Design a binder for this molecule. Structure first.
Ligand code: GTP
Ligand code: MG
Length: 231
């Protein structure tokens, strides 16, 4: 099962200086131990970092393989990395099209652990993404329902709707995932539920990576929809 985690991404200004929680969700699913869960996963990278084997000149990360409870899940996060001097996106398609990619070729791409790893990967375990290539089986569509540093929520939901349209054209299974529900805003959660109820069989899993609630449920729910359609 190849799972792509997608959501609002871009420049600091487009994220209101607060990402929506993709990285912490992936980190908690793949490595839920306190020692391996990191709350801080910056997307502002030096050219050396971006060209390292973890990022591999891509705007996505390979978070690794999960083999828990027998189903194998391969996890990736689609994001956007900005330059640590110019603060513009690294020149690697627009995010909404990039994130909806279902064929992800990055030869010799290494699994991501933390930003400390970047440009220093000999210092960490070096596990390669399988075959240098992943055919995406399904998408988790993250929606931050936290007030999260005075975010323009309606612009988030507009972005989510356009991203959803691109994903839906693929006919791949999508599960909507509400993030940071430990700080959830009822108006935002309700708006997200109304949006998802406007779509066909769009499931919503309410998660908090920080408090570790319903993360596994989110991924297993997607895996179940994946085999719904595979059958
Ligand atoms: N309260 C709470 N805060 C969270 C949670 N998850 C993430 N955050 C905060 O939100 C910020 C965003 O974290 P990320 O997971 O990197 O967000 P992102 O979607 O990956 O952002 P980009 O990768 O830059 O697109 C983090 O610095 C955390 O402090 C959560 O589950 N609960
Ligand atoms: Mg991220």
């Amino acid at each position: 099962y190849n799972i792509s985690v997608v959501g609002l991404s871009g420049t600091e200004k487009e994220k209101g200086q607060c990402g929506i929680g993709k990285s912490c969700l992936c980190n908690r699913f793949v490595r839920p131990s306190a020692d391996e869960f990191h709350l801080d996963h910056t997307s502002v990278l030096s050219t050396s970092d971006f060209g390292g084997r973890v990022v591999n000149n891509d705007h996505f990360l390979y978070w690794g393989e999960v083999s828990r409870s027998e189903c194998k899940m391969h996890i990736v996060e689609q994001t956007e990395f900005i330059d640590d001097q110019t603060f513009q996106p690294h020149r690697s398609q627009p995010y909404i099209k990039r994130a909806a990619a279902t064929k992800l070729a990055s030869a010799e791409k290494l699994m991501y652990f933390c930003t400390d790893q970047l440009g220093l990967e000999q210092d960490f375990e070096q596990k390669q993404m399988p075959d240098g290539k992943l055919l995406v089986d399904g998408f988790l569509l993250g929606i931050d329902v936290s007030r999260g540093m005075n975010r323009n929520f309606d612009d988030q939901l507009k972005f989510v709707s356009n991203l959803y349209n691109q994903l839906a054209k693929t006919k791949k299974p999508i599960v909507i995932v509400l993030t940071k529900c430990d700080e959830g805003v009822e108006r935002y959660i309700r708006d997200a539920h109304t949006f998802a109820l406007s779509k066909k069989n769009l499931q919503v899993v309410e998660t908090s990576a920080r408090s570790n609630v319903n993360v596994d449920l989110a991924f297993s729910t997607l895996v179940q929809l994946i085999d719904k359609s595979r059958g």
